[PDB]
Write a protein that binds this ligand. Structure first.
Ligand SMILES: Nc1nc2c(ncn2[C@@H]2O[C@H](COP(=O)(O)OP(=O)(O)O)[C@@H](O)[C@H]2O)c(=O)[nH]1
Ligand SMILES: [Mg+2]
Ligand SMILES: [Mg+2]
Length: 166
């Protein structure tokens, strides 16, 4: 079976854990990053006949070596070279995620954005222009509400597309 390796990353409290649990099958490996007690979760899912290995990365605001988490996350991306990184973003806190997205691009990460908590933005009267984000960043943006079991299928399809290339 053709297999890819993808990574999830985002700011703390974006629902990354929820999306990780949704994306993956039941068999999740809970280890630690080498040398430290920082938890490392790994799982997988199959989609359209292909296997996607999922690595959860530590939640971070940047990749400028400001903490053990930023150091782990960056070392993984640069050295493991996942086939895709899914940058999970809080629809209600989109601006603060700008530097993370920018630094992912700078280090040359193949990127896809998952825009989570759309329901919460909806209830908070926060409108978000996804097409304008996609155009500006030149990366696909997948709107979802992982806690409402909304858009996980979209996320999986978008992932299977993004690992190829144009
Ligand atoms: N409204 C809303 N809340 C969510 C969604 N996904 C996750 N959450 C909430 O966000 C909080 C943090 O989720 P978590 O998976 O721990 O985010 P993490 O810190 O990045 O791992 C949880 O209490 C979830 O209930 C969503 O799609 N919509
Ligand atoms: Mg699941
Ligand atoms: Mg699971």
């Amino acid at each position: 079976m053709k297999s890819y390796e993808i990574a999830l990353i985002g700011n703390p409290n974006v629902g990354k854990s929820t999306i990780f649990n949704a994306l993956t099958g039941e068999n999740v490996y809970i280890g630690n990053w080498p040398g430290v007690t920082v938890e490392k979760k790994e799982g997988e899912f199959e989609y359209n006949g292909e296997k996607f290995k999922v690595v959860d990365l530590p939640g971070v605001y940047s990749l400028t070596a400001n903490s053990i988490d930023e150091i782990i996350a960056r070392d993984y991306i640069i050295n493991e070279k996942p086939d895709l990184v899914v940058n999970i973003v809080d629809a209600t806190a989109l601006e603060r995620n700008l530097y993370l997205t920018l630094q992912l691009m700078e280090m040359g990460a193949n990127l896809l954005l998952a825009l989570n908590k759309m329901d919460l933005a909806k209830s908070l009267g926060i409108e978000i222009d996804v097409d304008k984000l996609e155009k500006i960043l030149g990366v696909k943006v997948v709107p979802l509400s992982a806690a409402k079991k909304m858009g996980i299928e979209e996320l999986k399809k978008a992932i299977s597309i993004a690992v190829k290339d144009l």
